[PDB]
């Protein structure tokens, strides 16, 4: 028996939808520390991770650590109920899968979905174990500009440090794009430990950026010399959505 109460239904839907940028089917893992989901694309270049520490849930109870697989149709059922209204979500296990109750906070009713879902056995959360030399903070609007620009111009993007700015480049034969980001134009924060550059799939970058939707918090991007890029946003109600993108070598 797994029983969870999320204080912010809006964020719950944002997490589910964000993971969907990488898979059609979602596995939720219920552990002693909270909830997580971890999915990679078939080529393993892009990973989505949702981490929700139990200390940000209103209520959290498991017997044994357990996974629940939501197939394509179950993901669609859940997202068909997505709403911006202030609400609570109660998630409980049933014999055949899950029950999800959404409780409107301001008057005031509640609605239910029943999800048929395979159970069981938590697989460990494995991320790149990597030291990332460059970090910067920005928001989804800026990253969406970048993603649309790169994707218009090339299949691959390169990000590097140049003095006290971030440089983003993309191009195909003559036809190129270059942007410079710095502290306060437009970056909220910028930490360059050591100089670094890496190249990434522009499509995978764009997919990660789509996965920031619905979250208001600032987004942190980290990268290193020929290392994976990490993109991390903390939900208002707690917990993180993280994407990792493998470099082109």
């Amino acid at each position: 028996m797994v029983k969870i109460v999320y204080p912010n239904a809006k964020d719950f839907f944002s997490f589910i939808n964000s993971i969907t940028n990488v898979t059609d089917s979602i596995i939720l893992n219920f552990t002693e520390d909270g909830i997580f989901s971890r999915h990679l694309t078939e080529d393993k270049v892009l990973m989505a991770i949702m981490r929700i520490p139990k200390d940000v849930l209103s209520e959290y109870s498991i017997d044994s650590p357990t996974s629940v697989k939501l197939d394509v149709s179950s993901v669609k059922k859940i997202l068909s109920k997505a709403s911006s209204k202030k609400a609570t979500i109660e998630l409980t296990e049933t014999d055949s899968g899950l029950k999800i109750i959404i409780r409107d906070e301001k008057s005031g009713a509640k609605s239910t979905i029943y999800i048929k879902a395979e159970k069981g056995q938590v697989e460990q959360l494995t991320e790149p174990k990597v030291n990332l030399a460059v970090n910067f903070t920005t928001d989804e609007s800026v990253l969406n500009v970048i993603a649309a620009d790169v994707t218009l111009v090339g299949e691959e993007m390169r990000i590097s440090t140049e003095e006290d700015k971030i440089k983003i480049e993309a191009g195909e034969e003559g036809k190129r794009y270059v942007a410079f980001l710095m502290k306060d134009k437009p970056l909220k924060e910028l930490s360059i430990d050591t100089s670094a550059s890496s190249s990434y799939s522009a499509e995978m970058f764009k997919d990660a950026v789509k996965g920031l939707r619905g979250f208001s918090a600032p987004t942190m991007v980290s990268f290193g010399e020929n290392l994976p890029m990490k993109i991390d946003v903390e939900a208002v109600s707690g917990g993180h959505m993280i994407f990792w993108i493998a470099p082109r070598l």
Partner: protein
Amino acid sequence: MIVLFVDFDYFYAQVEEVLNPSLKGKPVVVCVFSGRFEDSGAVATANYEARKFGVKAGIPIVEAKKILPNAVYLPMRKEVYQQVSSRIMNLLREYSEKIEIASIDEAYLDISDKVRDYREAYNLGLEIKNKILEKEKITVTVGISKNKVFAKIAADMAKPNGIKVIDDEEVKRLIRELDIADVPGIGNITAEKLKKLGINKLVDTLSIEFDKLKGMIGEAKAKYLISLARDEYNEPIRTRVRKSIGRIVTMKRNSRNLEEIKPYLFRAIEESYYKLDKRIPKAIHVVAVTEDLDIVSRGRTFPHGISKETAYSESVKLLQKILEEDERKIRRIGVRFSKFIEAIGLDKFFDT
């Protein structure tokens, strides 16, 4: 096949000892100083004197310094290690051409065509060790076996300044007797599940369902471990990474007939994609050799990849262009691919 693997011993730190021989026999710790603060970074490499005390690659410099406060800490001087390594790789090329340079301190030689048997391979390994000591003052460990993985295990078992052969009889023994975590490529992340799956040995993977191996798991790792345990893993030594890949084929007769040329061009394509494998090319050129032995080619670039289907349809268009632009008969037809997109999985950053 006979693979001779060379692993340079504690390389970065050994180079610092060559440069300053008054360091030899004391702990030497080469570090990558990052990062935001005093002593931010990680040990790159430690000599064996330092390793004794548990100072080793990847530990933070601060933790190394607590353990060995009086050891010699040096910043990484990559240019110097790289110059030394390039020279040694160049020496090794003189033993076999025929060499896969796997990293700055690791090379695999296929010497199947150089020696008769393992006893000759062993003596060739001693000459190589003597050569590298004479030219660069660097000690290395040599591992000799039937494939790259067992050559590397042999060097793991012999380092530092060692040389070891693992012959056919010992290969059979180690499949049974060797901890699976000690198999090259299998990090603690894959191997530490199988420890709790009742798979403690390479052989233990022959008693698990092939599908059950993909797994915990993953298909490519499954076909790897299974063909090792099956003693069917070979090789081969990958020499330099090509910038273009393709195939040209001779036709039975000179022709300008698209319908007669097409089957030859399609088979070139077929042979080519097999070699590209995971590489997605952005450019394709069709190459024709004319009856009078001139070369005529035409190509096109596609910013996103070229799939085999795209290559089929685009190659016909480029052949049509050749035929429109040159009056001559062609005798050979071929295709080359270039400008590769090569994705590496987030894999290669988990291990270990």
